[PDB]
Scaffold this motif. Structure first.
Motif, PDB file in Angstrom:
ATOM      1  N   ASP A 276     -15.886  32.630 -39.155  1.00 48.38           N
ATOM      2  CA  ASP A 276     -17.272  32.285 -39.475  1.00 48.38           C
ATOM      3  C   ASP A 276     -17.580  30.802 -39.314  1.00 48.38           C
ATOM      4  OD1 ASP A 276     -17.392  34.957 -40.158  1.00 48.38           O
ATOM      5  OD2 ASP A 276     -17.560  34.616 -42.331  1.00 48.38           O
ATOM      6  N   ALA A 277     -16.674  29.935 -39.759  1.00 50.21           N
ATOM      7  CA  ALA A 277     -16.892  28.495 -39.653  1.00 50.21           C
ATOM      8  C   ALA A 277     -16.956  28.078 -38.194  1.00 50.21           C
ATOM      9  CB  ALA A 277     -15.787  27.751 -40.360  1.00 50.21           C
ATOM     10  N   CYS A 278     -16.184  28.755 -37.356  1.00 53.47           N
ATOM     11  CA  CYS A 278     -16.164  28.468 -35.928  1.00 53.47           C
ATOM     12  C   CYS A 278     -17.467  28.950 -35.279  1.00 53.47           C
ATOM     13  CB  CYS A 278     -14.980  29.179 -35.263  1.00 53.47           C
ATOM     14  SG  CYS A 278     -13.377  28.352 -35.401  1.00 53.47           S
ATOM     15  N   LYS A 279     -17.896  30.157 -35.649  1.00 55.30           N
ATOM     16  CA  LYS A 279     -19.112  30.769 -35.102  1.00 55.30           C
ATOM     17  C   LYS A 279     -20.369  29.918 -35.365  1.00 55.30           C
ATOM     18  CE  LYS A 279     -19.182  35.097 -36.158  1.00 55.30           C
ATOM     19  NZ  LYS A 279     -18.554  36.191 -35.336  1.00 55.30           N
ATOM     20  N   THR A 280     -20.356  29.187 -36.476  1.00 57.02           N
ATOM     21  CA  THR A 280     -21.467  28.328 -36.873  1.00 57.02           C
ATOM     22  C   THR A 280     -21.182  26.896 -36.423  1.00 57.02           C
ATOM     23  OG1 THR A 280     -20.440  27.735 -38.991  1.00 57.02           O
ATOM     24  CG2 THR A 280     -21.817  29.713 -38.959  1.00 57.02           C
TER      25      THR A 280
ATOM     26  N   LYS B  29     -15.169  22.653 -34.912  1.00 62.57           N
ATOM     27  CA  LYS B  29     -15.357  22.451 -33.474  1.00 62.57           C
ATOM     28  C   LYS B  29     -14.170  23.069 -32.744  1.00 62.57           C
ATOM     29  CE  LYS B  29     -18.945  20.155 -34.603  1.00 62.57           C
ATOM     30  NZ  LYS B  29     -18.485  18.758 -34.870  1.00 62.57           N
ATOM     31  N   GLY B  30     -14.050  24.388 -32.818  1.00 67.72           N
ATOM     32  CA  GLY B  30     -12.936  25.033 -32.165  1.00 67.72           C
ATOM     33  C   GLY B  30     -13.202  26.501 -31.997  1.00 67.72           C
ATOM     34  N   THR B  31     -12.255  27.186 -31.355  1.00 69.87           N
ATOM     35  CA  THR B  31     -12.339  28.614 -31.071  1.00 69.87           C
ATOM     36  C   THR B  31     -11.044  29.307 -31.458  1.00 69.87           C
ATOM     37  OG1 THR B  31     -13.728  28.259 -29.088  1.00 69.87           O
ATOM     38  CG2 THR B  31     -12.557  30.374 -29.235  1.00 69.87           C
ATOM     39  N   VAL B  32     -11.147  30.439 -32.143  1.00 69.69           N
ATOM     40  CA  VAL B  32      -9.944  31.193 -32.468  1.00 69.69           C
ATOM     41  C   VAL B  32      -9.682  32.027 -31.214  1.00 69.69           C
ATOM     42  CG1 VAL B  32      -8.866  32.970 -33.914  1.00 69.69           C
ATOM     43  CG2 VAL B  32     -10.453  31.254 -34.954  1.00 69.69           C
ATOM     44  N   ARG B  33      -8.623  31.661 -30.498  1.00 65.63           N
ATOM     45  CA  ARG B  33      -8.256  32.319 -29.258  1.00 65.63           C
ATOM     46  C   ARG B  33      -7.441  33.591 -29.429  1.00 65.63           C
ATOM     47  NH1 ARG B  33     -10.720  33.254 -26.509  1.00 65.63           N
ATOM     48  NH2 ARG B  33      -9.032  33.851 -25.076  1.00 65.63           N
TER      49      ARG B  33
ATOM     50  N   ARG C 266     -10.647  42.072 -34.022  1.00 68.40           N
ATOM     51  CA  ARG C 266     -11.198  42.945 -32.988  1.00 68.40           C
ATOM     52  C   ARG C 266     -12.726  42.934 -33.050  1.00 68.40           C
ATOM     53  NH1 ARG C 266      -8.522  47.610 -35.328  1.00 68.40           N
ATOM     54  NH2 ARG C 266      -6.378  46.842 -35.653  1.00 68.40           N
ATOM     55  N   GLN C 267     -13.262  43.038 -34.267  1.00 67.24           N
ATOM     56  CA  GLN C 267     -14.703  43.040 -34.521  1.00 67.24           C
ATOM     57  C   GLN C 267     -15.365  41.774 -33.984  1.00 67.24           C
ATOM     58  OE1 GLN C 267     -15.266  43.944 -38.893  1.00 67.24           O
ATOM     59  NE2 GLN C 267     -14.726  46.047 -38.274  1.00 67.24           N
ATOM     60  N   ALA C 268     -14.629  40.660 -33.989  1.00 64.96           N
ATOM     61  CA  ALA C 268     -15.147  39.382 -33.495  1.00 64.96           C
ATOM     62  C   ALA C 268     -14.788  39.153 -32.026  1.00 64.96           C
ATOM     63  CB  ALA C 268     -14.593  38.228 -34.346  1.00 64.96           C
ATOM     64  N   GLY C 269     -14.256  40.174 -31.366  1.00 66.73           N
ATOM     65  CA  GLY C 269     -13.880  40.029 -29.975  1.00 66.73           C
ATOM     66  C   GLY C 269     -12.707  39.091 -29.688  1.00 66.73           C
ATOM     67  N   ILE C 270     -11.831  38.875 -30.666  1.00 69.53           N
ATOM     68  CA  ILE C 270     -10.674  37.996 -30.490  1.00 69.53           C
ATOM     69  C   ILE C 270      -9.431  38.820 -30.175  1.00 69.53           C
ATOM     70  CG2 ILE C 270      -9.106  36.355 -31.662  1.00 69.53           C
ATOM     71  CD1 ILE C 270     -11.729  35.741 -33.452  1.00 69.53           C
TER      72      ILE C 270
ATOM     73  N   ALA D 262     -13.131  28.196 -48.777  1.00 70.62           N
ATOM     74  CA  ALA D 262     -13.914  26.978 -48.690  1.00 70.62           C
ATOM     75  C   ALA D 262     -13.091  25.809 -48.130  1.00 70.62           C
ATOM     76  CB  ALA D 262     -14.483  26.627 -50.064  1.00 70.62           C
ATOM     77  N   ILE D 263     -11.911  25.556 -48.695  1.00 70.41           N
ATOM     78  CA  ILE D 263     -11.086  24.434 -48.237  1.00 70.41           C
ATOM     79  C   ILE D 263     -10.275  24.572 -46.937  1.00 70.41           C
ATOM     80  CG2 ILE D 263     -10.901  23.808 -50.649  1.00 70.41           C
ATOM     81  CD1 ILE D 263      -7.875  24.371 -50.415  1.00 70.41           C
ATOM     82  N   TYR D 264      -9.852  25.786 -46.595  1.00 72.05           N
ATOM     83  CA  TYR D 264      -9.087  25.953 -45.369  1.00 72.05           C
ATOM     84  C   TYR D 264      -9.948  25.606 -44.157  1.00 72.05           C
ATOM     85  CZ  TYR D 264      -4.695  27.516 -43.278  1.00 72.05           C
ATOM     86  OH  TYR D 264      -3.439  27.580 -42.732  1.00 72.05           O
ATOM     87  N   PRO D 265     -11.157  26.192 -44.047  1.00 67.73           N
ATOM     88  CA  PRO D 265     -12.014  25.869 -42.897  1.00 67.73           C
ATOM     89  C   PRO D 265     -12.397  24.369 -42.841  1.00 67.73           C
ATOM     90  CG  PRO D 265     -12.707  27.919 -43.942  1.00 67.73           C
ATOM     91  CD  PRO D 265     -11.786  27.220 -44.901  1.00 67.73           C
TER      92      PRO D 265
END
Length: 188
Positions: free
Chosen positions: A19-23, A27-31, A47-51, A154-157
């Motif tokens: 979610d933090a990436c999608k917004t 500044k990154g992408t979960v590959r 899978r739901q997020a297409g990753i 909250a803190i990890y992202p």
């Protein structure tokens, strides 16, 4: 900034990262998402997020060595700038820890949470940021967790966003934010 997430279970931390990436808060992408547990629910969130996802089962390999070599080879196909452990229950090999030195993170459910740079096999290393969760008379152990889990999401992202930004680095088994060496308790 390529991000690869390793999980063993539900994947709620993985979701907060997605979610933090999608917004673009990160500044990154979960590959890719890797699991060492067949059908972990986190694989479904990915899978739901297409990753892309991959599952490597210990019972599927000849030894810990063979397993670790296959895991590293597969993760590396994704050129991660950061490998984040989010509920990954496997004890790492020194070789894995060494291979991702300075770019391997972990979130610790310890009342409080903390994310570290992993410099040892048990996911330990310098603390980057940690928070405390208060308890009250009447608190159910499942009230505590929820609070803790909310805190982790909250803190990890946030910490990962510092890394994705080039602001956070690991040198001399210590964490450095904006060029300042952080104290044993992390950023304050």
């Amino acid at each position: 900034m390529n991000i690869v997430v390793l999980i063993s279970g539900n994947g709620s931390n993985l979701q907060a990262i997605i979610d933090a990436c999608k917004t673009n808060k990160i500044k990154g992408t979960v590959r890719a998402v890797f699991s060492n547990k067949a059908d972990a629910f986190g694989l479904e969130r990915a899978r739901q997020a297409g990753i892309a996802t991959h599952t490597l089962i210990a019972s599927a390999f000849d030894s810990r060595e063979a397993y670790d070599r296959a895991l590293i080879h597969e993760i590396d196909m994704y050129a991660p700038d950061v490998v984040v452990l989010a509920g990954f229950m496997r004890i790492l090999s020194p070789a894995f820890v060494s291979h991702y030195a300075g770019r391997l993170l972990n979130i610790h459910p310890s009342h409080g949470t903390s994310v570290h740079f992993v410099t040892d096999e048990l996911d330990g290393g310098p603390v980057i940021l940690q928070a405390k969760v208060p308890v009250f008379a009447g608190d159910s152990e499942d009230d505590i967790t929820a609070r803790v889990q909310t805190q982790e999401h909250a803190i990890y992202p946030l910490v990962i966003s510092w890394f994705a930004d080039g602001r956070l680095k690991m040198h001399e088994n210590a964490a450095w934010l904006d060029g300042q060496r952080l104290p044993p308790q992390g950023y304050a």
